[PDB]
Paper text:
Kinesin-1 transports cargo within cells, a process tightly coupled with ATP hydrolysis. Whereas kinesin-1 in solution is mostly loaded with ADP, ADP release is accelerated several thousand-fold upon microtubule binding. Here we characterized kinesin-1 P-loop mutations that interfere with ADP binding and determined the structure of the corresponding mutated nucleotide-free kinesins.
Apo-[name] kinesin-1 was crystallized in a new crystal form following nucleotide digestion by apyrase and gel filtration to remove any trace of nucleotide. The crystals diffracted to 2.6 Å and there were six identical molecules in the asymmetric unit (r.m.s.d. of Cαs in pairs of molecules varies between 0.3 Å and 0.55 Å). The r.m.s.d. of Cαs of the apo-[name] kinesin-1 compared with ADP-kinesin-1 varies between 1.2 Å and 1.5 Å. By contrast, the conformation of apo-[name] is much more similar to that of apo wild-type kinesin-1 bound to tubulin, the r.m.s.d. of Cαs being close to 0.8 Å whatever the apo-[name] molecule considered. In contrast, apo-[name] differs from apo-kinesin-1 bound to tubulin in a small portion of the Switch 2 containing L11 loop: a stretch between Switch 2 and the α4 helix is disordered in apo-[name] whereas interactions with tubulin stabilize it in the complex. In apo-kinesin-1 bound to tubulin, the structure of L11 changes and E236 interacts with the Switch 1 residue R203. Since it is disordered in isolated [name] apo-kinesin-1, E236 does not make any visible interaction with the P-loop and with residue 87 in particular, leading to a higher mobility of the P-loop.
Author numbering: 6 to 19, 21 to 194, 200 to 238, 245 to 324
Write the structure that this text describes.
Amino acid sequence: ESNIKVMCRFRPLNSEVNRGDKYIAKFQGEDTVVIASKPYAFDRVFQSSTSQEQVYNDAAKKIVKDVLEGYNGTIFAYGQASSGKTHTMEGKLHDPEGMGIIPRIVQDIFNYIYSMDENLEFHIKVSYFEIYLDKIRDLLDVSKTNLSVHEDKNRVPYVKGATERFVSSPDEVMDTIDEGKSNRHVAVHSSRSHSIFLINVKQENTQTEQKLSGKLYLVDLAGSEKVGAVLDEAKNINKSLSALGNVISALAEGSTYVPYRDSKMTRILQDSLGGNARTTIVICCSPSSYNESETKSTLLFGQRAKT
């Protein structure tokens, strides 16, 4: 019903072994992981050996194909520091085996476009903003610090004043990602804000003249903090995570009312999370004994989306 799939990735272990740490995690097949004799069931659990490409294949690929066919979708990344969130989501820029989910999404989009030359015409608009201290901040125009979410006549959400930049190649998309990353709020390199990257795929069919439109959101979630300006960061981070969790949970349990309005991120993502929309949540975990509570913390958060 809900269309949310939660997938958990554990990374290989070192470099770190010199500390003295154990593996702490056992896998009952490919969808369940056991820690401290407690079982956590998911839709897929990627073990240490799982390649970048099959993470993309199982987590994101069908979502991309759906957006190229007119649907909306969302992929979330969630993880405590050094869990492998960045390796999973971005990976190694121009190494194909190699690269993480976001570069593979972009390559599939453009290969499809190239393979569909004349018969389909495309316009890809990308936007990039972060939820920092409950404020919507544009990562492509530092002057736009405090933007708002609204709904149109059809109850379709949009962020007012957000930069939309036209892109025509994979490099142009990646250039845009790097520009936004430069302005993203970091501390201690923890992300202190949640960042949302939007690819809007607009197409028109040359034979039939009919139009299609699809929105793919890539959300990098800041991890929950247990702790001045860094305190306001923690309470906002945590409150917005609980708002997401409430939505995500109401959809998973089939609630007829879903509390999208209780936070800005979920208002933005209302046309792309729940309903017809396709969603994958990738939670990244360290296997080390040193981080067992963090992992167990991440795992519980992932559990909220699990029917």
